[PDB]
Design a protein around this ligand. Structure first.
Ligand SMILES: *CC(=O)N1CCN(S(=O)(=O)c2ccc(Cl)s2)CC1
Ligand SMILES: *CC(=O)N1CCN(S(=O)(=O)c2ccc(Cl)s2)CC1
Lengths: 304, 304
């Protein structure tokens, strides 16, 4: 029993983190096989960052200008290329700790673990979600760029995020490992505002199921609703619309608890309209939306 | 910017987790040098657990009855001893992944990371605190016993907790790595109730400093207070008394923010008396108390 915001064990990702320096800029790289992936803004002088032309800046850079350090040992850069907003630094040594891995692009609402790094060195691990506005609410200081987000399926690390920047509002933006930003963001120091950070309804419902499984039941009520009725309430409270696809994904939690998804929708509806009245659910005073249905099943069943 | 509940990177601890089986009971062990540490209740039949005499049960156990598996490889047990509520299984092979380590006994209010394991395999990492009633609020299913809590100082893992049991109230109890329970708990299936789970005041104050550093400032007010005045309010709200020692520990956060500790005490006093009024601080609707002053300085300064 108990339900915690839980990150994947980070060891397989710790073994991939390196330091990348170009000129006076130091940040993190991800070493998989004989390629080091890092944000392309490693080539920018803070002056460059206001209106950088990355193809033009990159012309002034040679392999020997990219300093790649794995622990206290230098790696030899034998090639470099730009793919979207990341650099691929080809090195002469395959990472001997390379795990089984994939590059995936996640959808809003999907959760992942972040291994926050500085100078190629792991500092902490925490759980994030891709927000509906394609930001993440992270913990990233200068030096953390190139830190990565990931999921693990048994022994295969799916890399989904690389950290690139902080918006003036202190929320975070980055890329998949193909260098494509999530959302409309660009690696330039310019006016970039986030859209509405709506609540991930399906994740809230998952977490209410987690609460019932863990003995927190006070918010269960005598009501049901319909997707259309619920969605009117969701819209009013800046919750994501619930689709039949989300109902289908919650089916295993419905089955385990014997609470119909639309009944749990009606519980959530009353919580939105009535508030918590100073009560808590799984130690929270607000409705948690950074657990996916899959996360809840994982944690409630002890998958390794 | 941003402030997340952050665990230590788990890799150094992942390399220490093994499976221990005695009879039909499987749980986790910690392999450091040539010793495997595990909960002594691994020797109990669920029947035994109601009123176990561990010295008497242990007489019926030989080295060859303790099955220790590190990944898919069996370790040879060449000795066993009981220290308080843990078994030490001497094995013929030093763990080649043994990190620098210490065994520490923590005090209430201290935070640590837990690597939740099943069958010797890491499932997740999360951040906990030793509660003032010597429970922890964990996430532990059957099979998770022997999972450990830890802090890291650069390259040295301080092991502070091993998981042993869940109370009927779904909160958790365990031992230091010398096998001494935190608090009054015993490894027996009996009536064990937790005392008052008071709020860790010094940790709340640390987190309010974290909030100011991260731009969440709405709760700062025009007031100050005294330790004695504050403590009257703390007592009423089931907060731990604040001592001068806690004020001293908050000195670096005071200095960075220019907010006197007693002023931040007066802000906290108003939050207790007035509530949050539906507002949030660092994405929380309740006052977070599982960040130590040291955790806040670590995360706000990017230590690795
Ligand atoms: C995004 C990131 O982590 N970066 C590494 C640090 N650099 S920088 O140009 O060296 C600095 C800019 C602000 C400070 Cl403080 S250091 C930016 C990219
Ligand atoms: C505390 C722990 O993780 N343990 C391992 C599992 N055993 S057991 O006796 O095999 C079981 C008791 C309940 C279930 Cl379900 S399995 C208890 C100790």
């Amino acid at each position: 029993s108990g339900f915690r915001k839980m990150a994947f064990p980070s060891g397989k990702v710790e073994g991939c983190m390196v330091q990348v320096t170009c000129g006076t800029t130091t940040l993190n790289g991800l070493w998989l096989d004989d390629v080091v992936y890092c944000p392309r803004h490693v080539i920018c002088t803070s002056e460059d960052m206001l209106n950088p032309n990355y193809e033009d800046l990159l012309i002034r850079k040679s392999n020997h200008n990219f300093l790649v350090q794995a622990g206290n040992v230098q790696l030899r850069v034998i090639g470099h290329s730009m793919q979207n907003c990341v650099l691929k630094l080809k090195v002469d040594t395959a990472n001997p700790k390379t795990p089984k891995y994939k590059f995936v692009r996640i959808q809003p609402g999907q959760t992942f673990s972040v291994l926050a790094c500085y100078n190629g060195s792991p500092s902490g691990v925490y759980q994030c979600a891709m927000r509906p506005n394609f930001t993440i609410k992270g913990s990233f200081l200068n030096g953390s760029c190139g830190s990565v987000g990931f999921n693990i399926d048994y022994d295969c690390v799916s890399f989904c995020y690389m950290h690139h920047m902080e918006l003036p509002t202190g929320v975070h933006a980055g890329t998949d490992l193909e260098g494509n930003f999530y959302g409309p963001f660009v690696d330039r120091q310019t006016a970039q505002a986030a859209g509405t950070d709506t609540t991930i309804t399906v994740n809230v419902l998952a977490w209410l199921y987690a609460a019932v499984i863990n003995g927190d039941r006070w918010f269960l009520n005598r009501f049901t609703t319909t997707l259309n009725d619920f969605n009117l309430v969701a819209m009013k409270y800046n919750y994501e619309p619930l689709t039949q696809d989300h109902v289908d994904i919650l089916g295993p939690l419905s089955a385990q608890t014997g609470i119909a998804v639309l009944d749990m929708c009606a519980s959530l509806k009353e919580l939105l309209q009535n508030g918590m009245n100073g009560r808590t659910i799984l130690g929270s005073a607000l409705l948690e939306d950074e657990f996916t249905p899959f996360d809840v099943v994982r944690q409630c069943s002890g998958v390794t």
